[PDB]
């Protein structure tokens, strides 16, 4: 039977670590794929770590120039939560260079975007097969949210964007039932940019905290429900949470207007935020100009009242370790026996040519946390790889 | 309960990619079998990629001289769709250097030909054990279709040939129930050659588009039903689709006669074609004298009226990448919930000594596509291996 999610999000006080891949550390000798961005989705029986393999193994000579992030070789694979992305346990899901997956209660749905830059299209797998295809409409890079989709009452939703990166794009909300699409509406959000949302369900309303890549230090917010009626805005919090940002004491914040800054207009990073009443568990990097470190801030009334009062702070990566994307997902009732959904989030750690020049490859390692009612301290659970690898020499 | 297939083939407008092995690219460091020709068959629960391993791993020194395509070490193995042919997921199916497999609803049937050249015979596995043996009758190389067999109402069919390669052979149609053979009729096709058919069911009639190796540029057609009454002919299409062929404007075509050409008489390549009313989705290589590139042509009335009007064209490999065999298979109702069968086709990409002289080995990588009602663009999903490998140095 289909998986319900019309139940409220759980109030949590601190996040406790759940699993850690050790993907790069083991990969020095073991056969492990080269990943760029992973994410986690939970079905009724088990949670699985999806990732976009680059078609080559670490230390393999095919890892040359893996910084290239769109190629015909990329594929979305799947491994049970915690296990390294090794070559012999990874179940194949779809071909893609941008994807999303979620479990609707019966079988996995997975969306995989492929094709040329200007003529991309998306293939919607359901249970192992393609059932439908969605083509671009503005004929630029088509993109999905790089994290789990949200399924409620058997219908799974996700957000796609097509258009320029550093300028106003066209965003659409999709709705599907048993693989094939059934509804589609466009977001008329003139003043901002919504690229790489992270979504979770909350009492029948899908909420997404997204990435602003155009004249914005602030997280966009999208809220929609069964029949795709939506509200669009910005995370009111007075504490900025995008990677390029001015220090907290200089920022002002706004609920509806985008807020630019000094050199922070044309860049950003995927993030997440959980609403708790009117507060928000906004996650952000420690550094204000680079993807390093990571924090979780519980901002009182940060969802609606431009507040700056940080009630609680937790650090999971100290400032000297590289970080990356971060996304949200929820563990459903069928797996907890709770009467509410337990929030969780995942955090990747990039290592490679983008910041470590000498290496020829680029991979990342995933870490997963979940909320806990009891308060929990933090620690620097860094990846711990030791570069350069044998192939870089 | 046995798997029905007495339902019509589904009308499709374009083929969307489903999976890609990345076998060779991963094999540079991972432990992967050396393949020569793969194919795909779909059961009620999952689809699987079969392949005739050569009994050695890539980069292993045993890969010496793997061009030899019949030796006492080949074996038909099986992997779930999309996963690379690695050494540790691979289930073992049968010993063979020529094989076919299909799922009849209860358990996998698999046929494996083995033995010396002049006294070969076939073993019919059913559910992991042998039940019956079929011996040669003209005492030359015995061959099965190198692609999935067609099962209807529990009876599985396949085509075998024995005799010369460049001259008139003897062809037979087999029918089996729960492993053991029950019926057998010979095809009295005097004017042509039918070697390596690709078959799919269509509303109770098994249809096969085969390979002509003797005075033929044109695809032979075989149609038979429950009790093995058959009709034999040629694909009427005015567009030739065998590898050696004259350009389309010089060809004329015929429904019943073989059509030779200038130097195109004693060679060919396995291919496929799906009937859509009176049109055909004939697949063919891009080049007219080599196995490179790949196209899919929807020829209006090409099945019966010698037409040349190409309504739609799709390219999946540009002319600069090597290609190879191609075969058909259908995803049944049990796995789609549709009231019709969804056509699909697979395309291998050979790399090795046959055209790249310096390498000592020979392997191929599989790519799978499936039909979609919506129109879909094409792209060059090439294998992307980087030869020579470490063992060729």
């Amino acid at each position, epitope marked *: 039977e289909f998986l319900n999610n019309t139940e409220p999000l759980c109030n949590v006080s601190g996040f406790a670590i759940v699993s850690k891949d050790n993907g790069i550390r083991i990969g020095s000798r073991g056969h492990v794929f080269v990943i760029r961005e992973p994410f986690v989705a939970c079905g009724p029986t088990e949670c699985r770590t999806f990732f976009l393999t680059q078609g080559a193994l670490l230390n393999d000579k095919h890892s040359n*120039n*893996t*910084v*290239k*992030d*769109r190629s015909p070789y990329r594929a979305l694979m799947s491994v049970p939560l915690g296990s390294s992305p090794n070559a012999y346990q990874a179940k194949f899901e779809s071909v893609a260079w*941008s994807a999303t997956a979620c479990h609707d209660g019966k079988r996995w749905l997975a969306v995989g975007i492929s094709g*040329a*830059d*200007d*003529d991309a299209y998306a293939v919607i797998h359901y249970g192992g097969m393609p059932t439908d295809v969605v083509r671009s409409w503005r*004929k*630029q*890079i088509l*993109r999905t949210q790089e994290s789990s989709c949200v399924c409620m009452k058997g219908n799974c939703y996700w957000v796609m964007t097509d*258009g*320029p*990166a*550093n*300028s*106003q794009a066209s965003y659409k909300i999709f709705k599907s039932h048993k693989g094939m699409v059934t509804n589609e509406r466009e977001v008329s959000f003139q003043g901002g940019h919504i690229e790489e949302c992270s979504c979770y369900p909350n009492l029948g309303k899908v909420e997404c905290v997204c990435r602003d*890549n155009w004249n914005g230090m602030n997280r966009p917010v999208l809220t929609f429900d069964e029949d795709l009626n939506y509200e669009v805005g910005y995370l009111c919090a007075g504490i900025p949470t995008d990677t390029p940002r001015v220090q907290d004491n200089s920022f002002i914040g706004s609920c509806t207007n985008a807020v630019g800054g000094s050199g922070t207009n*044309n*860049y950003g990073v995927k993030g997440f935020g959980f609403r708790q009443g009117n507060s928000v568990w906004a996650g952000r990097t420690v550094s204000i100009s680079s993807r390093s470190g990571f924090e979780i801030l519980l901002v009182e009334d940060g969802w609606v009242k431009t507040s700056k009062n940080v009630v609680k702070k937790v650090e999971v990566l100290n400032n000297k370790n590289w970080s990356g994307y971060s996304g949200a997902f929820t563990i459903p009732i069928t797996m907890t026996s709770k009467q509410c959904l337990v929030p969780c989030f995942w955090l990747e750690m990039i290592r490679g*040519k983008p910041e470590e020049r000498t290496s020829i490859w680029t991979s990342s390692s995933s870490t997963v946390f979940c909320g806990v009612s009891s308060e929990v301290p933090g620690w620097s659970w860094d990846d711990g790889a030791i570069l350069p690898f044998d192939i870089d020499k | 309960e046995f798997l029905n297939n007495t339902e019509p083939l589904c009308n499709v407008s374009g083929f969307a990619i489903v999976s890609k092995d990345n076998g060779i690219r991963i094999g540079s460091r991972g432990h992967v079998f050396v393949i020569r020709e793969p194919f795909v068959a779909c059961g009620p629960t999952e689809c699987r990629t079969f392949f005739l391993t050569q009994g050695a791993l890539l980069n292993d020194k045993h890969s010496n001289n793997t061009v030899k395509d019949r030796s006492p070490y080949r074996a038909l193995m099986s992997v779930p769709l999309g996963s690379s042919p690695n050494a540790y997921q691979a289930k073992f199916e049968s010993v063979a250097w020529s094989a076919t497999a299909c799922h009849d609803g209860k358990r996998w049937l698999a046929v494996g030909i083995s033995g010396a050249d002049d006294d070969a015979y076939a073993v019919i596995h059913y559910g992991g054990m042998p039940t019956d043996v079929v011996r040669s009758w003209r005492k030359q190389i015995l061959r099965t279709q190198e692609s999935s067999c067609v099962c209807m109402k529990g009876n599985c069919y396949w085509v075998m040939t024995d005799g010369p390669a460049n001259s008139q052979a003897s062809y037979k149609i087999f029918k089996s129930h729960k492993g053991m053979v029950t019926n057998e009729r010979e095809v009295s096709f005097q004017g042509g050659h039918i070697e390596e058919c690709s078959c799919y069911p269509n509303l109770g009639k098994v249809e096969c588009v085969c390979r002509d190796n003797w005075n033929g540029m044109n695809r032979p057609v075989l149609t038979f039903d429950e009790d093995l009454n058959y009709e034999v002919g040629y694909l009427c299409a005015g567009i030739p689709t065998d590898t050696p062929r004259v350009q389309d404007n010089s060809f004329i075509g015929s429904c019943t006669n073989a059509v030779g050409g200038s130097g195109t008489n004693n060679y060919g390549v396995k291919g496929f074609g799906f009937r859509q009313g009176n049109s055909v989705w004939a697949g063919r290589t891009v080049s007219i004298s080599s196995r490179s590139g790949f196209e899919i042509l929807l020829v209006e009335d090409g099945w019966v009226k010698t037409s040349k009007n190409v309504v739609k064209k799709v390219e999946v490999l*540009n*002319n*600069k990448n090597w290609s190879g065999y191609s075969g058909a298979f259908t995803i049944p109702i049990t796995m789609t919930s549709k009231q019709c069968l969804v056509p699909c086709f697979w395309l291998e990409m050979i790399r090795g000594k046959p055209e790249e002289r310096t390498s000592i080995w020979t392997s191929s990588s599989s790519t799978v596509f499936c039909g979609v009602s919506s129109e879909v663009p094409g792209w*060059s999903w090439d294998d992307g291996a980087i030869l020579p490998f470490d063992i060729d140095k």
Partner: antibody, heavy 117, light 112 residues
Framework: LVKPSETLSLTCSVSGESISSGGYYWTWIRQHPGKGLEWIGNIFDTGSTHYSPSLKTRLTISIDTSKNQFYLRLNSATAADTAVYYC???????????????????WGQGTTVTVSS | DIVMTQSPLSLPVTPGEPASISCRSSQSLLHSNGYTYLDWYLQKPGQSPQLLIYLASNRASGVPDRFSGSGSGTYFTLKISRVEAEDVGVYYCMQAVQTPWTFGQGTKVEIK
């Protein structure tokens, strides 16, 4: 026509599309008689500019989003500056995590400039 | 700047036959972000240039299916599978790696 040592000015217009739509970089390209092409500079919808080093001291390029026009100014024009001038659009970006580039997909008709008395 | 050179100055061709043009650059055009920024442009008599190939291999929209491209590092190649009467013109290669974009010398295609 332009006399030597004067200041050259040119105008280019956009229609169908609107400046600040699609996030394109607008480019000026030059072609001397009998020679190959040469690249002058770029302007983004928001006014950020790039110049070719050899002409950086003479050039000035700007936009007027209300008129859907962008302009080229070249000071101290020499006789050698005689050439055909094209204006084109090119949409590309290098910051984001999904870069793209569609080089110079649209060109306007050339304008012949002769620097002589 | 990237010094760009082009192999044939003039390429005699005839309809129906394959044809090839090549370019070499003084520095590898493999940008740090992994993409290879090189294009090919075609200028027919009495017209402003047109876009053929906008990266090492990608064809532009509307271009005839007869064109192709390949190459990496410093050496690149444009391939015409079947030359036709409409292909007469001057072919320029371009690179978009560095701040100053530079074009090639220009290979003229003359039918024979």
């Amino acid at each position: 026509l332009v006399k030597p040592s004067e200041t050259l000015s040119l105008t280019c217009s956009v229609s169908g599309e609107s400046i600040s739509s699609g996030g394109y970089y607008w480019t000026w390209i030059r072609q001397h008689p009998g020679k190959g092409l040469e690249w002058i500079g770029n302007i983004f919808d928001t006014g950020s500019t790039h110049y070719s080093p050899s002409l950086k001291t003479r050039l000035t390029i700007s936009i007027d989003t209300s008129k859907n026009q962008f302009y080229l100014r070249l000071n101290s024009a020499t006789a050698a500056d005689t050439a055909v001038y094209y204006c084109a659009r090119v949409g590309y970006s290098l910051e984001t995590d999904r870069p793209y580039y569609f080089g110079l997909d649209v060109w306007g008709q050339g304008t012949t400039v002769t620097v002589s008395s | 700047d990237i010094v760009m050179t082009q192999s044939p100055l003039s390429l005699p061709v005839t309809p129906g036959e394959p044809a090839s043009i090549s370019c070499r650059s003084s520095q590898s055009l493999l940008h740090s972000n992994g993409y290879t920024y090189l294009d090919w442009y075609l200028q027919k008599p009495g017209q402003s240039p047109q876009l053929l190939i906008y990266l090492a291999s990608n064809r532009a929209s509307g271009v005839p299916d007869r064109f192709s491209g390949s190459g990496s590092g410093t050496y690149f190649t444009l391939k015409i599978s079947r030359v036709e009467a409409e292909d007469v013109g001057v072919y320029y290669c371009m690179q978009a790696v560095q701040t100053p974009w530079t074009f090639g010398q220009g290979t003229k295609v003359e039918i024979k």
